[PDB]
Design a protein around this ligand. Sequence first.
Ligand code: HEM
Ligand code: HEM
Ligand SMILES: N#Cc1ccc(C(=O)N2CCC3(CC2)N=C(N)c2c(F)ccc(F)c2N3)cn1
Ligand SMILES: N#Cc1ccc(C(=O)N2CCC3(CC2)N=C(N)c2c(F)ccc(F)c2N3)cn1
Ligand SMILES: C[C@H](O)[C@H](O)C1=Nc2c(nc(N)[nH]c2=O)NC1
Ligand SMILES: C[C@H](O)[C@H](O)C1=Nc2c(nc(N)[nH]c2=O)NC1
Lengths: 413, 413
Amino acid sequence: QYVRIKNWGSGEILHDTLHHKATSSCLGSIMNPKSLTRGPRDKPTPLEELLPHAIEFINQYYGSFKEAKIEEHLARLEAVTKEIETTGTYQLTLDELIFATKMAWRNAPRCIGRIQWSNLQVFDARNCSTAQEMFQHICRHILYATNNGNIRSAITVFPQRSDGKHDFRLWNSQLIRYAGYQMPDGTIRGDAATLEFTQLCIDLGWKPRYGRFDVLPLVLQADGQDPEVFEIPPDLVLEVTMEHPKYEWFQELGLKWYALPAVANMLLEVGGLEFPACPFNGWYMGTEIGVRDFCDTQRYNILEEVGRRMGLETHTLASLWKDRAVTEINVAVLHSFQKQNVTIMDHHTASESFMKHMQNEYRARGGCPADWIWLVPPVSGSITPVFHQEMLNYVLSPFYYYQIEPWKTHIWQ
Amino acid sequence: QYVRIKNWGSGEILHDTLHHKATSSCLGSIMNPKSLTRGPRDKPTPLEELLPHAIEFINQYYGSFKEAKIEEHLARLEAVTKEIETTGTYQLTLDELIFATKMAWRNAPRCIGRIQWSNLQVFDARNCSTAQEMFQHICRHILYATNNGNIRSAITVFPQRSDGKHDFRLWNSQLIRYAGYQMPDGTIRGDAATLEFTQLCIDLGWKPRYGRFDVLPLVLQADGQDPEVFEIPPDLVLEVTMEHPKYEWFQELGLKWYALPAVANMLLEVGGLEFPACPFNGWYMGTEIGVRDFCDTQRYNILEEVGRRMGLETHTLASLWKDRAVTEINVAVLHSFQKQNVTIMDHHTASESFMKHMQNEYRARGGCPADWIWLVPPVSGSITPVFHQEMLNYVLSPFYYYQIEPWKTHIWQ
Ligand code: HEM
Ligand code: HEM
Ligand SMILES: N#Cc1ccc(C(=O)N2CCC3(CC2)N=C(N)c2c(F)ccc(F)c2N3)cn1
Ligand SMILES: N#Cc1ccc(C(=O)N2CCC3(CC2)N=C(N)c2c(F)ccc(F)c2N3)cn1
Ligand SMILES: C[C@H](O)[C@H](O)C1=Nc2c(nc(N)[nH]c2=O)NC1
Ligand SMILES: C[C@H](O)[C@H](O)C1=Nc2c(nc(N)[nH]c2=O)NC1
């Protein structure tokens, strides 16, 4: 009929008709494509499908170590199929999970930091059973990963999807994230990008502090039950206050940001099995905060303000005052993280390391999936090596999929 | 077998194997895809194919003006098919060509300036027959478009492809473009991106001036004969010398650039007909010169040099000295063009106008093909509106196709 097109800036929509008159239509510039999303279930995974996938993964796993172990491999293959026809699903051995979590990461086409893929702490919470236990595991994760500034990459894997109506899910987009409130005077305080979720939290019994940087609460759902609201212990949320190395009025903007970048709502697919709850984290890249979180119009939007305090021709696009401001903001962020001894990386050194990663990856296993639109930084694109690098974007497995917003598809006793 | 991947930065190559283990492989990040290229011929266009295309175009054309002219439409349809079965091919009426050139432009998914699509001078050189006449038409084009700085968009359409072995072709990538020479001391002077073509020119009897900014000659081929070398009259090549509004040492870098951005080697497809020679031009966008031509490693590469003269920590990526330098370079360019009264636009105002264009385009004809990777500026991407804009990239018609390098596929009496 017609393809829907969204402008994530003004949130406006457009309906494309013309594409029909095409000749021989790329979905690359699409943020959330269905090919990347892995939705719900109602019944277990049809044995005919699971079995093959499961075998494939076990061959990948065993076909991983130098000088394999054929006996164990056969036995394992044997043991798994056996366990499958006896229960339907199956259980991965800790080592397979670890292998799975790293490989899935390794296969994340949108991750600039995959050079670290082998360095990953894996917390086994597959035995978790209640929301309080989830909350406890998450806190442990947040504490371990934060490590007082010296950030450590980590993932915590909760129970796998069984039937499809007993899914463990984190409703938050990320572990730490500020709240956004619609104020009475018509203005929006905090992170406008979370106005909805903040409200959902308000709705579930959360007390709004009406501030610019109130860390939203964890909204966990275990087994299949409704989500319970858990506030995050302030002692666990490390933050960096922003200050510019030259302009002393920067800190006057009273800005800050959390140090832990952790994705909360993705699904880990492996060997036919799927874990809809597996929060993981790495560390920040300056431009994420300096450019996206601070300069996006749909976000904190401090560009106009920084330009004025800089004495720039804020009313003349051609003056390139925006390019000037954004740069100082980016340096304030980097500066601030470095000063407070909190791990972070600039987009430049990041691009170089990815290029190195990619080089290794092609040698090692001839290939490395990569989404160019996502790997090129939001600023200074061609100044970066990855911009001049052609790359293929394909979905391997194990893989980390996006999934449907839990509040769209969910019961509610 | 395996997909070839090129890094246009270090020119290195990579062979992708992994993509085979894919699930449900995007070619978006590919510079020159075959789907966008339109190669050679040996025999005319099979009547069965041409006829339908021709009818389609004539319906588009007539189905263009408000309150159509059914009589003329039928007559025209009638007249064309008639002319087709009598000659094989057919001739477009000046108005159809004009309509075709604008629509093709309108359908260029990689053009940030399509808001100007209706403003276009069309030079009818379909009667051209010799290389000297091509040279004359080109000179006229260069003179008209340059207009002493007040740049005007223009295209000159030479004879259409007949059999396939009587093609008019410009061997140059663009009308004006500096030469690159491999020096005896191992260094490369001028534009390294034209080392090959410069040599080809040398080979065809061109005298190399061994300078940093020697405008390469026109290498025209008419009918089907070999290419003849025509040097461009210096009086016709307008240039802007670079100088920074604050740093007076900028002009000490002794830099400049031509004012006329004109593509020379593309092919215009319309109504089944194809014109392999139709140089066209618009005006420059600062970042093209300041960022790509001056800061690309494979080009003039003046970033390192500008950073030092700025007194930046040139040996510390994290300092973001590159982001600082690039900005001043961009301002020098804009500044210099403005000072010398030569049309140019900054990437910011450009992005805003495209967004407006796109808005109009969807309203008018519900859709507007757009290649995101090409529309987002090489620097300050997310600071621009088009970065947050989702878009579809499809090939309509009439369209401007890329084509195979003439020196790869050509006779040679
Ligand atoms: C060790 C440092 C790491 C760094 C610096 C890093 C950095 C990044 C950055 C900058 C993005 C861009 C996100 C955006 O633009 O929204 C990203 C995406 C991604 N990363 Fe990494 N990462 C790291 C570790 C990890 C780990 C440990 C995993 C998982 C095991 C991982 C999985 C992913 C995935 C799935 C995406 C896509 C997220 C999405 O599409 O929203 N990364 N990462
Ligand atoms: C009036 C002002 C115009 C401006 C400012 C403009 C600007 C641009 C820019 C900045 C690009 C990017 C090129 C690159 O990154 O290599 C581009 C591409 C393109 N433009 Fe425009 N343009 C204009 C007029 C035109 C005209 C008159 C035509 C043709 C009738 C046209 C056809 C195209 C095509 C086919 C491309 C793709 C070129 C390629 O793929 O190499 N443009 N233009
Ligand atoms: N609008 C908005 C918006 C979106 C995401 C966030 C956010 O907190 N995100 C944190 C996670 C995010 C992306 C930024 N940033 C990272 N370094 C990162 C990481 F280290 C590992 C894995 C990821 F998937 C990562 N993506 C904040 N605001
Ligand atoms: N390496 C390299 C390299 C490539 C192209 C050029 C060059 O001269 N190009 C001039 C034409 C180029 C792209 C830049 N720049 C434009 N504004 C432009 C235009 F106004 C109309 C149509 C185009 F297709 C256009 N593309 C210089 N160096
Ligand atoms: C529309 C456009 O694709 C989108 O707004 C962009 N967002 C992102 C992106 N790249 C990253 N890293 N993160 C994003 O969210 N690419 C482009
Ligand atoms: C590899 C990468 O796609 C390529 O080097 C880039 N070149 C260009 C681009 N965008 C424009 N406008 N021009 C280019 O030549 N997109 C990216």
